[PDB]
Amino acid sequence: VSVYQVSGTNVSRSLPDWIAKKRKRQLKNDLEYQNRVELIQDFEFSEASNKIKVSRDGQYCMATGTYKPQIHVYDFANLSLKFDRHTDAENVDFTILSDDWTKSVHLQNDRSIQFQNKGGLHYTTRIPKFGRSLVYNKVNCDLYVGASGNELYRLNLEKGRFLNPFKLDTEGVNHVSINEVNGLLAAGTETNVVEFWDPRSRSRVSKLYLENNIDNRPFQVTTTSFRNDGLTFACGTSNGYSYIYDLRTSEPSIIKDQGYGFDIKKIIWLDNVGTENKIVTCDKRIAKIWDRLDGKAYASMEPSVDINDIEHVPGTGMFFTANESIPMHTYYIPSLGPSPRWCSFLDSITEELEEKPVYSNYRFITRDDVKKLNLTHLVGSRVLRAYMHGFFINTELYDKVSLIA
């Protein structure tokens, strides 16, 4: 499959971007500098980017920065920065209430919820304890804030009233997500359990215990996401294992290993694009696409810099990623679907695009883990294809040795 990097740094992973700015003056003469195409002007933060989301209407995007902590809003109809707005403390998570960019809620890291209206900062309120995720229930206008403590806070936008907080059995909520079809809330606790709640009442419909046989290590639920079908459900773990659950049955329908041992940062359901059976499980380093039924890898995105968030423009084949780099990357996999209407001519330049392409296909293992698994004797064998400081093993063969070990 063909993956094109429409925007993003094209230097070595070892080379940082700021020197490329210093190289920029020296390389102005080079023709490639003229030929390179930037899709959105200033599509970049000073040092790094934290979160990226697209407004439902499809013409505006919003992003958050590291320093000075700021809030870009991009206008697709003009391919340009609309306005940048500074803040008091760095962002941890937000949502866009309105269909446009006008109306948003931002959970900062200093424990404060800031309500950004179109004019400017409207109101700032504080939750009792530190926040980790934030979701909005359109049906009740009740905003739900995960927290370090057991209780899951509830804020009611309609009444302007903190309501009775939900109480979880375990402490620490890493992500929260609301099923659109049913209203089921899933709360990702620190311990290997995901607790489901009914919003109309205030109860615990059930708690699912995640079981991984491969690794005995403890693992934390880091992300959750409900598919629009209203039945399937996804989980991430801190061990880099993404589960797909049919809610009715407790058994995990499929378990896929990302293989780098890094926490899963986001799950996106690619139902809208067509050929609905695909899903994205984004890591610190890789964003893999694969099919929900067979578990086979479809495509992989391997940016040169760490991924903090990934977002899929609905109805299109485009992907944005907020990175630890100065620019935010934009990818375009034509096979998925047509280019967006605002990028109407993106197809025209496909050949001029970079067209980036083993690493997603196999499972990565460190030198130490090889010793734990007593696979030292295979070092140098065609089974162990060494890369970087570790060795790659077929996922199936990894499952075999781990159980034996």
Partner: peptide
């Protein structure tokens, strides 16, 4: 204790009053 919001206060807050209106449709499933 209650200072800095560490104790949860359930008063009406004027600026956020009627910030968004609930949808009358409700959940799509019956």
């Amino acid at each position: 204790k209650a200072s800095k919001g560490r104790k949860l206060n359930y008063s009406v807050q004027d600026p956020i009053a009627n910030y968004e209106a609930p949808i009358t449709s409700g959940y799509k499933w019956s």
